[PDB]
């Protein structure tokens, strides 16, 4: 539901 | 390659043509650019996914300014400002 | 096996897990069942796809009964009743 | 061949692509089919043109049934139900 | 000459008389002046087209301040503030 | 010839062009035809004039059926349904 | 004299008594004072006419600050803030 | 002759001109005729007075049919349907 | 004495008891205090009357700041902010 | 004589004058008569009390017909239709 | 003792148990604390009573800043911001 | 004895007092009785759980009549009518 | 251990799995983080419970800035801004 | 419709 | 309808 | 549709 | 209805 | 869908 873009 | 979460396959991860050959679905488009501010994501942008419209977006574009805030709302169920 | 329009891959055709392990995205769910009446499609069913929510749905669940009406709304772009304020 | 009121040209009469390759502008689409009921016009049909959205539509799809009523709404300027808040 | 996207002809590109002999359709009018700010476009003005009302308008008049923003919303489907 | 209440002149009685060459002002149009039902008046018709939009209209198109009701709404000032939020 | 656009006659241009002997119609009243700010027009005031309510009003009282803006919206069809 | 509750005077009983020469105030007009249905009162009519707009009106035009219901709404203060948002 | 505009009589101009023996009608109350700001009028206060609710009120409490503005809106028909 | 739940006193049981000499508070008025239908209660009547406006009212005037339904809404706290936006 | 205006008795003035044994009615609660700001009243606080919800509240919490304002609105009929 | 999904404990199965001594939380109350119709459930009843208010309720009280419809709304996540604006 | 107010048992106080094995009910989630600001509570945070949605939240996130305010609204019946 | 209070 | 708290 | 007042 | 978090 | 005016 939540991440850092990579 | 990557896995596609839509079909479960190992995938080239081509541009989405769900809407038409030239047009992504808004969920697929939302992986690369924010549906609030319309900026391409930068590496390390904190993003979260609305359970309603299925789109990713910047935490900061929903007034969520910390990992702590993002984890709390994502955990209980995130309903973005657009869908409210 | 199935063509995934989202990524281009050919797949065994697995449940969408875009939202999470327990939840298809609404567009993927709308392939198999109408997001208005929550019924599985018939082979015979006229369906069309909203440009605003990316969902398929029964023509009849939007008060469009004929290929004539469906054809006519695609000429301009279909905005479904659930997306219209 | 057809007169284009938009640019003044005489044309072979090709699909409007003002919106894009797949999409007529709503005014051009409204020449051939009603934007309220999504049905192709009859020769017999009373139609009128909204001053706010530039679309043609069935008089009957706006609850105007007669040349009397159509004539009367043109005297003041027609604002269609879809443009009225 | 130009091509007219409405009829597909090579065209003089005369003033639109769709509404009446003296009155353009709002889409044709929107090619020369912004329907938000009512200013004539200046050469190099960044403009985009709403998929609803079929009008062009200034990106800046929709709080889209870069080519990047304009490309992202135009790609996925632009619904202007007037039509929302 | 006709008395113009707007300017005081006697006139041959020409189409109002206050809005433009193609358009009567709504008050002038409302002299000849009802702005609710878009029908030309009968000699027999009870009509009244809204204090907010200056338009004449059928009493019946505002659910006023009698001289009693019309007389009663003029005592206080008529605000028509189209002007009421 | 003047022409009256309502009746087409050459006219003294008397006060309108459309509403009652003492009361103008709002369109006639709007020729002499602005229906937004309720100021008498001053000579050279830029004014335009709403196609809905048939009233004249100050351009500046509708956030139209130039002849260019006034010509553009009047040309395509002016719907004033009161009628929207 | 009539008692004026507004000023305390006894009067010949002249048309209210509080609004202007042509217009009664709504409270004075509501003495003779219902501001909901625009009909003159009967001797038999149950009427009550709104605390928010000061108007009299038919009990029945507010869906109050009995002295029981009227008595009950006066115990708490009557806010009429036209004053309620 | 004064004339009462309600009954037309020469009058002592007693407190209104229209609502009850202790309670004025809002129109009569509005002759002595403003229904917007709830201040007693001061001698020379510019006031005007709404054609809807029949109340007097301060011009300044309706953003009418001059005799010119007050005359213009009162002439054509004044609908106060409370009734709009 | 009557128990006053508001102050704890035993009283001869006098008209509430909390609002003023002429006006009961809405909660006190709601003891004797329904604030929805404005009818005096029956011995047989199912009534319940809103947690938001403190008023008693007919179960039936809120579409609750049985002790089962009344019991069930008290388990969670009753918000009446007049308090719900 | 005091008189209770609800029952007319001479009274100890116990906590209201109208809603339940632990819960006042909002009118009784409003005698001791403001339903707008939720502050206990201080001795000499100017308060007035809404004719709709039957609650007392601070004049200042309804933008009534003087005895003059409070007397004028209380006299004609006070409808608080919560009930409007 | 009963499994509490809220805390993981096995319990004798006591009235929820999460809100207070007199009040179950709405989710706990919704186990025994429908928050739409305020009726106790049948063994036979199709029920589903809203993702927005955490309440159980009759499928039929949301116009879902079949396991087909219930299954279909769980694929995407159920937002009940009381949570939808 | 603790008591669980939902079931009345002495309890390990495990994560709520009311919504699904991975998802708390919003009431249980609201014991550890504020549903307004999405911050984990800090020791000594003043919190109160809405009688509608059954959630705890920061007093300051409802513009209740003192124990006095919190006690007054909690006593009479607290309806949070989300539920109003 | 408009006066000064006196 | 109006008082000072005492 | 647009003029200067004179 | 009201507490400090501990 | 997007251009510079020329
Ligand atoms: Zn999917
Ligand atoms: Zn795929
Ligand atoms: Zn963003
Ligand atoms: Zn969303
Ligand atoms: Zn896609
Ligand atoms: Zn369907
Ligand atoms: Zn849609
Ligand atoms: Zn055109
Ligand atoms: Zn049609
Ligand atoms: Zn239109
Ligand atoms: Zn076209
Ligand atoms: Zn052309
Ligand atoms: Zn612009
Ligand atoms: Zn648009
Ligand atoms: Zn006139
Ligand atoms: Zn008519
Ligand atoms: Zn009108
Ligand atoms: Zn005219
Ligand atoms: Zn004339
Ligand atoms: Zn002006
Ligand atoms: Zn206008
Ligand atoms: Zn009076
Ligand atoms: Zn009546
Ligand atoms: Zn009223
Ligand atoms: Zn009067
Ligand atoms: Zn009098
Ligand atoms: Zn004032
Ligand atoms: Zn008014
Ligand atoms: Zn009490
Ligand atoms: Zn009842
Ligand atoms: Zn209630
Ligand atoms: Zn009482
Ligand atoms: Zn008592
Ligand atoms: Zn206060
Ligand atoms: Zn109140
Ligand atoms: Zn839980
Ligand atoms: Zn049910
Ligand atoms: Zn729900
Ligand atoms: Zn519980
Ligand atoms: Zn438990
Ligand atoms: Zn917080
Ligand atoms: Zn709440």
Residue numbers in the entry:
A (entry chain E), N (entry chain E), O (entry chain E), P (entry chain E), Q (entry chain E), R (entry chain E): 1514 to 1519
B (entry chain A), E (entry chain A), G (entry chain A), I (entry chain A), K (entry chain A), M (entry chain A): 1054 to 1137
C (entry chain B), D (entry chain B), F (entry chain B), H (entry chain B), J (entry chain B), L (entry chain B): 1054 to 1138
Paper text:
The crystal structure of the MLL3 ePHD6 domain revealed that it contains a canonical PHD domain preceded by a zinc knuckle composed of two antiparallel β strands and an α helix. The MLL3 ePHD6 domain formed a dimer through two N-terminal cysteine residues, which coordinated a zinc ion (Zn0) with two cysteine residues from each protomer of the dimer. The dimer involved only the preceding zinc fingers, but not the PHD domain itself. The residues 14GAKRHR19 of the histone H4 peptide could be traced reliably. The H4G14, H4K16, and H4H18 residues formed main chain hydrogen bonds with the main chains of Q1102, I1100, E1097, and D1098 of MLL3, respectively, allowing the β-sheet formation between the H4 peptide and ePHD6 of MLL3. The aliphatic chain of H4K16 stacked with the aromatic ring structure of W1109 and interacted with the hydrophobic side chain of I1100.
MLL3 (also called KMT2C) and MLL4 (alias KMT2D and ALR) are two closely related members of the SET1/MLL family of histone H3K4 methyltransferases, and often act as tumor suppressors. In this study, we set out to clarify the histone binding nature of the PHD6 domain in MLL3/4, and find that an extended PHD domain including the PHD6 domain and the preceding zinc finger (ePHD6) in MLL3/4 specifically recognizes an H4H18-containing fragment of histone H4.
